[PDB]
Amino acid sequence: MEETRPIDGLTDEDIREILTRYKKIALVGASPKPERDANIVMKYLLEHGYDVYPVNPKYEEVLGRKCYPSVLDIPDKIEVVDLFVKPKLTMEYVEQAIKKGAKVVWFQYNTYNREASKKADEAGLIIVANRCMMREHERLLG
Numbered sequence: 001m002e003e004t005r006p007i008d009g010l011t012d013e014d015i016r017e018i019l020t021r022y023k024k025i026a027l028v029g030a031s032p033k034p035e036r037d038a039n040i041v042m043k044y045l046l047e048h049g050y051d052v053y054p055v056n057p058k059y060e061e062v063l064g065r066k067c068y069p070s071v072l073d074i075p076d077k078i079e080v081v082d083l084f085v086k087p088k089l090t091m092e093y094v095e096q097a098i099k100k101g102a103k104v105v106w107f108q109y110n111t112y113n114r115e116a117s118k119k120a121d122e123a124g125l126i127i128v129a130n131r132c133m134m135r136e137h138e139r140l141l142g
């Protein structure tokens with residue numbers, strides 16, 4: 001009688017490790033609108049010690065942080081690309097994540113793209129899917 005478990009196949013321990021260790025985040029789809037999920041999670045991660053670089057070519061500053069047009073333009077190392085964009089947009093961002101040397105691609109709810117997931121797996125990145133960083137942080141480090 002196997003229980004349902006997340007499809008990315010990571011244990012609670014693996015996620016807790018990624019949430020404790022990898023705190024340089026490129027948050028793609030960042031938005032200054034309070035209503036968007038990306039704004040709520042970006043504020044929460046900044047309140048919990050994450051260094052969050054918003055990425056969205058539309059904006060130059062979001063929540064007081066300079067906003068970049070690509071993960072590759074961020075002047076720092078990036079460990080996690082946290083995706084708040086539609087599925088077909090994620091392939092490009094996974095490609096940027098690979099070229100930047102990120103360690104983890106994190107597909108937030110309704111962003112998963114199989115093809116993008118495949119390029120990330122081929123390059124060796126850890127893939128987290130169908131979870132929220134905020135909710136996993138609350139569940140595991142709360």
Ligand SMILES: CC(C)(COP(=O)(O)OP(=O)(O)OC[C@H]1O[C@@H](n2cnc3c(N)ncnc32)[C@H](O)[C@@H]1OP(=O)(O)O)[C@@H](O)C(=O)NCCC(=O)NCCS
Pocket residue numbers: 028029030031032033036037038041055056057058084085086087089108109110111131132134135
């Ligand atoms: C993926 C998602 C944003 C789609 O929602 P949607 O209502 O269709 O919104 P859109 O994709 O049109 O736009 C959202 C943002 O993407 C940004 N965006 C669009 N194209 C982009 C691109 N190429 N690069 C970066 N950002 C982009 C837009 O600027 C927009 O922000 P804005 O309204 O400030 O302009 C949405 O399903 C989502 O928020 N998923 C994550 C949900 C989640 O995990 N919530 C946490 C719950 S605890």
